[PDB]
Design a protein around this nucleic acid. Sequence first.
DNA 1: TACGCAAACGTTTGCGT
DNA 2: TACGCAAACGTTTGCGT
Lengths: 339, 339
Amino acid sequence: ATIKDVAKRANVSTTTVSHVINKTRFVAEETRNAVWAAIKELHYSPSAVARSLKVNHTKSIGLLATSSEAAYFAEIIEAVEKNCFQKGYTLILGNAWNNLEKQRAYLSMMAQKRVDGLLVMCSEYPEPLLAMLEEYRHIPMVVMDWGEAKADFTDAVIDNAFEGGYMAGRYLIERGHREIGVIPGPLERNTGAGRLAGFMKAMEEAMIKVPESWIVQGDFEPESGYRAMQQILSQPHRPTAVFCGGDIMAMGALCAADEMGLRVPQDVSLIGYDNVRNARYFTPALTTIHQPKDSLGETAFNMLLDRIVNKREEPQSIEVHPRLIERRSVADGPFRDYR
Amino acid sequence: ATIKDVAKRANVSTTTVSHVINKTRFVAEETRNAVWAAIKELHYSPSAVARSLKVNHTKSIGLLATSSEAAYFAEIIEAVEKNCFQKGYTLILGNAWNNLEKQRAYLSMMAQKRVDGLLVMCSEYPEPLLAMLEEYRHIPMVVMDWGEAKADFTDAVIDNAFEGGYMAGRYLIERGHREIGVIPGPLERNTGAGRLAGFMKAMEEAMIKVPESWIVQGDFEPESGYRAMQQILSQPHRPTAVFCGGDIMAMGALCAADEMGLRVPQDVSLIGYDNVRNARYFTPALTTIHQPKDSLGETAFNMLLDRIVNKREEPQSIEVHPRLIERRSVADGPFRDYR
DNA sequence: TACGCAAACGTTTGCGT
DNA sequence: TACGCAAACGTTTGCGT
Ligand code: HPA
Ligand code: HPA
C-alpha cells in the first residue's frame, strides 16, 4: 500500500525502496530483489501525487482547446497526445467552447493541478482572454493558433494561413476562373480571416473583383457550408468556382450543390482548406490546401518541453507551411486557354 | 506562493486561510476579507497536489481510449469531457491504439496519478487485457464498449449493437431487397461482430442467403470502405444493396461507387451505422442506424461517479438503444411491390 | 561498501481554549 | 465567539557512518 509497507516487508529503509524504484543510487542485487518482491506482493503503485509534491513537477500537460470533435481539431489533439505519451507526459484535455467563464475555470483548475505547461488553442483571443492568459505567464505555455505572435509571454507556432489563402486563389486563377466566390470561416480566428485575406490578395493581383453577394460567412461547421453554397448558387449570376475556408464546411457545400442538382466540378469547382483525413474520400475527392496538423502538434509540444526542461525565458515562434493538394473537385475555367 | 505566505500576510493562521478558502467553518467577515486580499496580491493558487495528498482523491478521471480522431470516438470523448467539467472533474486522455504495452503503460501512469475512476474504451478485449484490467479492480471503472458484461469487476454500458444490426437488415428487407452485401467492422469488437450478427439474424429470418463474395471485412476506416465496396461491385453478380457497419467506412463506400460510375441509391442502396455528426451531409445524405453517443458518455460517467461517491461495490450494467434514421441513400428494391 | 535518519514538500483537520 | 497547534498524508534527499 505505502512505501512504508514495502520497506517493512523488505526489511530495508524506505530510503532504500525509493532508490531501487528510481535507480537513483547503487543497491545490492539481493537488496533490490527483495524490494521488488515486496513491491510485488504488496501490489505497490508509487504515488505520483506524493512524488510531485516533493519533486515539484507533475509530468503532465494541459490542453486548453475550443472543442475536440471537429475533424480539424481532433487531428491536432491526437497528435499532441502522441507526443506527450512518448515523452512520458500525461494529457489533460479541456474544451472551453470559446467561453470566457469556461476558459477562466479550466485555466484555474489547471494551475491548481500544477501542470508543467499549457498548450493553448482557443480560436478567438479577445482582450479579456488575452488578459487571463498573462495572469499565468508563470506556467510555461505555447499558443498553436495565431498567425502572428499576439504576445510576448508565450511561444507560438504560426501556420502561414495567408500564404495558403493565396495559394488557393492562385490555383483557381491558373485553372481559368475569374468568377469566384468564397465561404470563409469566422473572421475572429486566424484560420478564418487569415485564409481569406491571403485569398483576396491574389484576386486583387489578378484584378478580380469579388462581389459581396458572393462572400458568405461560415463557421467551420457543415451546416454553414450547406447554407452558404446554397445562397451562392441560388442567385441569378453565380461564380464558376468556390473557395471554401474549411474542408468540413466544404463537405457541406458539396451536399447542397448536389441537392440543387449542380455538378461538381462540372457545374461548379470547389476548393477547400485543411486537408482533413477524410477529404480524399469526399465525393468527389476534395482538392484542398493541406495544413500540417501533425507537425503543428509536435512542433508545439517540443517548444513547450524546451521551455520546460531547458527553463527557457524568451518567447519563441515557429512557422509551419501549407501546401496545395490537387484532387478532383476542380476543373478548368472559361479562361484557361486564354493564358 | 504558499498557504503559509498567505496566512502571514493576513496575520491569521493557515488553518484559517484554509477554512475561508474551503468555507469549511465560520470566519469573521473582516477575517475572510483579509485572507482574500492577501490571496489576491500574493496571487495564490491553492495546490491540488497538496490537497489531494491529504484528502485522498484527485477529482480527476482517466479515459483509456483506442484513439480519438475517428469521428465515432471523437464524439463520445467530447461528451465524456462535457460531463467531467460540469461535475468539477479533470479529464486525462489516453489513446492505447489497441496496443497491450501501451495499455499497460497508460493504465499504470493513471493508477500512479491516482485517478478517482477509469472510463475504458479499448475496442478489443483479449484475455491479457482482461487480465491487466482486473489488476486494477481497486480503481473504480466502467467499460463503455462491450455488448455483454465481460466481467464482474466493472460497470458496463451496453449498446444493443445486435438489435441495431437487425434493424438495418429489416429495413432493407422491407424496402424490397434480397440481394444484399455487407461490409462489417472488425469481428474482435462489439460494434463489429455484434452489428453483423444482428444483421445476419434478419437475413435468416427472411431466408436470404448472403454469398461470401458479398461480405467484405472493413476496419472502420474509409479506405477500407472504399476497397470493400469496390470488391463488391467489381463482380459479375452484385447485390442491390449494401449494409455498411460504420458511417465513416460508408463514406468510403460512397466515393468508390461514384468513382466506378455507380449511382447511389439509384444503382446501389447503402445503409450505414453510427449516425456521426456529418452523416447528413454525406452525398447523398446517409441513411443509418443512430448510436446514442452522447448518452453513452453521460451514462458511463454517471455510473462511475456513483461508484465513486456512493462507494458502490456491485457491478452494474446499463443498456442504451439504437434507432434507424432514414435519409436518402436507400431506394426501393425489386421486391417492394411484392410484399 | 552499502544503506539509514530525519526533515521537508503544501495542505487539512481533530481537539483544544 | 472565533480562531490556532500540531500531526499527518506519501514521498525524496542531504548528510551521515
Ligand atoms: O476554428 C476552426 N475550427 C474547425 N476547423 C478549422 N479549420 C481551421 N480552423 C478551424
Ligand atoms: O471501433 C470503432 N471505430 C470507429 N468507429 C466505430 N463505430 C463503431 N465502432 C467503431
